[PDB]
Ligand SMILES: NNNc1ccc(NCCOC(=O)NCCN[C@H]2C[C@](O)(CO)[C@@H](O)[C@H](O)[C@H]2O)c([N+](=O)[O-])c1
Ligand SMILES: [Ca+2]
């Protein structure tokens with residue numbers, strides 16, 4: 001193979017930019033005042049502490065013990081792409097409930113358990129549990145990066 | 152009377168000749184079916200040269216003999232083309 | 235304490251991620267299948283053996299290849315036509331000298347009950363005499379540049395444009411192009427191969443399209459790149475369904491793919507090389523695809539580039555005979571390697587591999603029905619079946635087909651044996667060639683010869699086979715079944731069998747199919763319905779039962795609903811503990827039981 | 832290279848500028864991950880810390896070589912994690928060029 005024909009990560013400018021963000025304290029935090037529970041999803045605003053860019057987290061518990069996380073800009077200049085035709089259906093949701101709260105945290109229960117989601121406000125973070133067993137964390141190394149659409 | 156396997160190995164009842172199950176190691180008990188892996192089917196082919204074909208081509212839907220006699224219960228109707 | 239961190243970095247779009255919480259890997263399979271769907275049920279012929287190269291030169295060559303298979307007693311379902319069959323790489327055309335009568339060629343193949351696959355790539359030669367190009371240009375269906383002109387790159391026909399397959403109107407145009415009126419020279423036994431659909435652009439960055447080319451809705455090419463090929467695959471598959479009036483199941487092979495591509499046919503691992511390490515890597519590559527829903531996977535048998543030594547070609551046939559998509563293919567400049575061109579000892583080994591594959595078609599077909607209904611992969615890593623055996627978590631020189639067969643193909647020149655890891659506490663495995671039983675867990679040293687394909691059947695399983703190998707699968711699909719019962723240590727076994735007409739959607743639209751459950755316990759083998767909705771008119775019957783790990787009974791008694799009780803004759807080998815029940819003679823559609831007294 | 836960008840002789844006018852997105856996931860108890868084809872690489876995915884991330888970008892690689900993370904013809908952005916105790920999957924639904932880093936603790 002002729003490797004010089006194909007970009008390494010360092011030659012891919014967005015990969016170079018992203019990969020230079022190393023594990024540390026995330027600047028994103030969730031604005032629990034904006035939290036809204038809906039028929040299909042929990043939505044809460046996220047903010048970059050330095051740039052003040054506002055994002056929207058759409059968090060969903062799904063039937064068949066799945067979670068969906070979608071993050072988009074709050075007021076984008078132009079719509080961002082959302083992949084069509086791959087999903088065979090709009091995935092059936094399960095109801096989210098606030099089953100715990102403190103100053104820096106909201107605990108959500110998917111339906112009637114056993115799956116729970118802990119949204120940490122500062123720094124922004126998500127933890128997924130079956131009862132008390134931690135299954136997976138999101139943004140635990142603080143590597144979330146969302147380049148907003150500029151002028 | 153019983154049937155003796157052509158190689159001489161075994162002997163089987165008369166109703167196990169052409170009963171669509173392979174009972175003979177040389178395939179000689181199934182000259183008219185597709186049941187034996189090493190059997191052969193004889194095509195008389197009157198008006199042309201007689202031919203032997205693999206047992207696996209009896210009623211496989213493909214016309215192997217010009218007289219069409221290898222396809223007698225397959226849904227393929229083979230015309231006679233021996234001329 | 236141990237932990238793995240995963241980080242995803244994407245150029246554009248939103249963040250959109252699904253977390254599939256298991257807890258078992260089969261739960262994950264079900265979770266992901268509910269999101270992106272399941273493996274399309276292949277028409278039966280497409281699970282047979284495919285003979286391809288770049289290129290068979292003309293109609294006479296194709297018919298000589300077809301006749302070569304029959305003259306050398308080797309089965310084959312499909313012969314493939316690569317890009318040199320068209321008029322100067324104008325797709326949907328035929329070279330007027332070398333393929334002047336495609337309908338007559340297709341009719342001769344149909345008379346042998348074989349199929350043909352023609353390649354159709356998504357790049358369209360910029361040529362005012364080319365009707366496809368003129369239609370797409372006139373209707374504005376091409377990918378564009380920012381200045382609004384149609385994008386033009388370079389591929390096999392030279393300068394070429396690229397239809398915007400993200401546009402639903404373009405996909406509908408493409409689908410309608412496969413009608414028998416539009417694709418002149420095509421017929422119902424002609425199926426399709428989509429290649430170069432990354433899309434490949436010879437003079438583009440990284441050999442693909444510019445990031446700032448513009449698609450339907452104004453989206454940039456950088457936004458959609460990885461589903462471009464999927465849309466090609468989808469539109470072609472829909473074309474093959476539509477041309478038949480919605481009755482025939484499609485077969486489309488695609489090079490590029492994405493999540494969801496399992497819905498549209500098969501994929502293969504591209505341009506590999508005729509070398510032993512490329513033979514080896516076909517297992518982890520197709521296993522990685524199987525884990526993410528693409529069960530209809532394979533690699534070019536023999537390697538695309540370079541000429542394989544005969545021993546390597548034999549081992550590749552044996553490897554490919556036990557992988558889902560089974561195609562021999564080769565580069566333009568390679569020597570001809572149709573399998574009868576080798577010396578007789580290599581021919582016989584290849585013929586045996588082909589026979590094993592064709593005999594296992596009912597098994598393969600049932601695994602693919604289970605994949606289609608449940609989302610379970612056909613070819614599986616050992617850890618999927620043995621999730622608690624940590625010594626299996628990295629194995630990639632072995633794999634399972636369903637839960638019943640464990641395969642360790644020979645993948646080294648001059649090998650004298652292989653080391654087979656047989657997993658499972660209190661599990662037994664049967665060498666399907668010698669019937670020798672082996673207890674798990676162990677690493678077994680198995681001596682091999684050129685003809686060896688190390689395959690083991692798991693205790694507790696029932697594998698259905700067509701023991702009457704014919705020239706193609708169409709010829710076999712009404713033939714009787716032999717059941718191979720591998721007894722567990724508890725004297726039990728179970729398995730399934732799916733049957734239908736082999737090529738239509740009638741199983742779905744009319745529930746015209748059979749799903750049988752075979753189960754053994756105590757000393758009784760029982761066939762019952764695993765889905766009562768399915769009914770099928772079929773002459774398929776049970777001609778034989780082979781039971782491994784069984785003692786000699788005193789008598790064998792068969793009971794079928796609607797018939798008197800009857801006696802079966804049988805043969806027993808005390809050395810191998812193998813019991814063969816002669817000609818049960820019962821329809822596969824009937825409930826029945828055999829009792830060993 | 833954040834806006835107008837060049838690689839070899841090819842130019843990306845990149846009219847919308849930098850728009851990349853990224854996010855990390857931690858899998859406690861998992862030492863083995865699998866998936867994200869297509870790569871000519873081992874079934875059990877390797878750590879990327881000392882080298883290149885795994886790349887998902889449908890590309891035509893002439894005479895591709897073995898045991899490396901270069902992107903090949905197909906991209907399925909799905910990663911499976913297996914341990915003695917549980918199985919998990921991550922499905923990153925994004926159609927753009929995507930890089931995947933894998934690290935162990
Ligand atoms: N106008 N074009 N000019 C031009 C002329 C020659 C060359 N050099 C030879 C390319 O080298 C190769 O052979 N690549 C493997 C291609 N493999 C594809 C396609 C195919 O081979 C035929 O459909 C299938 O059989 C394979 O299965 C499928 O994967 C180039 N070039 O840019 O290299 C450009
Ligand atoms: Ca007989």
Ligand SMILES: [Ca+2]
Nearest residue numbers: 208213215221
């Ligand atoms: Ca015939």
